[PDB]
Amino acid sequence: LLQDNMANSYNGGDFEDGLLNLSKEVFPTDKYLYQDGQFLDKKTINAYLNPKYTKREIDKMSEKDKKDKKANENLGLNPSHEGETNPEKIAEKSPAYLSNILEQDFYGKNIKGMTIGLAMNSVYYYKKEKDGPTFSKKLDDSEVKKQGKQMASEILSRLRENDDLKDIPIHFAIYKQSSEDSITPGEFITQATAEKSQTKLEWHNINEKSALLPSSTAADYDENLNNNFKQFNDNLQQAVGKVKFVDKKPQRLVVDLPIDYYGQAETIGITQYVTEQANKYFDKIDNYEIRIKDGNQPRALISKTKDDKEPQVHIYSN
């Protein structure tokens, strides 16, 4: 259910791992206990994802819908439809900018910190009729960012009304999804930390690009990495990678390497060779993992973090 309230599963998965990655900076694991978010329950999140309603829109809403939607609190962060009901006109004037909200909680149970991620649309999808094709409207990049920041500010005000949450630092980050058809996921675009007791949000751009390897995108951002990956593949006589460029510098390389249904001895031999090649071609990347798998299951994992002298190798049991 990564695809729930997201453009696709890729974005859903990438958004969460990316939020976690920021949390690992702000609330390091050596200092904080990590938990799934508990303070915004799913009914509350669903209400925040609604459009803001006009008086007349609430007037004609059923008691049941008013209840499910928390209508008398009118918590929707998305643009009001302002009485408009034509799907295309809504797409033109009041498309949904906010797709999902993800919360992470941190402890030393006295909460000590929180991270809030906002997943935004780069593209708004709609149908003009029940069984009709999908239509789309491109959203403006700067408007997406402006919207995210304003929404994060309103979320922070709502959180600070909770007596348990008066004081903790709360980190916000804004993720812009790619299109539903993109295999490449979106990227974080900005973040801000409300430090102790702060009820307002000063933002820091994030210059991040998700890329496949090999690709034109990778060649564009870091030609040497792209050439090295191609050479890694050529040496393998196949492998497909993904990477983030942050300020043009590659990080968080993930490589998938499909193999045939080999025995365990061959699996070790494959890992011996691939480890050698990763040393040769990926050494400038702080964090990487290579997932070796056959058509049934993971067979081996080679991984490297910044404080690894050498890459670490795990062979999965039968």
Sign of CA dihedral 156, 162, 168, 173: negative
H helical segments located in 100-166: 141-160
Strands of the 312-315 sheet, one edge to the other: 208-213, 240-246, 249-258, 288-293, 298-304, 312-315
Say what the alpha-carbon torsion angle 196, 173, 120, 142 is, to the nearest 10 degrees. Answer: 100
The answer for residues whose C-beta is within 8 angstroms of residue 262's C-beta and 6 or more apart is 270, 294, 299
What is the experimental resolution, given in Å to one decimal place? 1.9
The residue type at 98: L
Q: Give the whole-angstrom CA distance, residue 152 versus residue 298.
A: 39
- CA Rg value for the chain: 22
DSSP designation for 310: S
If DSSP codes are grouped into helix, strand and coil, which group holds residue 151? helix
Residues forming beta bridges with residue 300, ordered by sequence position: 292, 315
The crossing angle, in degrees rounded to 10, of helices 264-281 and 216-235 is 130
Residue of 282, 279, 178 whose CA lies nearest to 222: 282
Q: Give the whole-angstrom CA distance, residue 285 versus residue 209.
A: 15
Q: Give the whole-angstrom CA distance, residue 122 versus residue 255.
A: 26
CATH node for 1-318 = 3.10.570.10
Sign of CA dihedral 24, 28, 29, 33: negative
The residue type at 249: K
Is it true that the peptide bond before 51 is cis, omega within 30 degrees of 0? no
Structure obtained using:
X-ray
Q: Give the whole-angstrom CA distance, residue 56 versus residue 74.
A: 13
What are 144's two structure tokens?
């997406």
The answer for residues whose C-beta is within 8 angstroms of residue 302's C-beta and 6 or more apart is 271, 274, 275, 278, 289, 290, 292, 311, 312, 313, 314
Q: What is the 3-state secondary structure (H, E, C) of 69-87?
A: CCCCCCCCCECCCCCCCCH
Q: Give the whole-angstrom CA distance, residue 292 versus residue 287.
A: 17
Q: In Å, how far are 91, 178, 183, 312 from 215, measured between CA atoms?
A: 33, 16, 12, 27
Domain ranges, ordered by start, for the chain: 1-318
Helix or strand run (H / E) with residue 312: strand 312-315
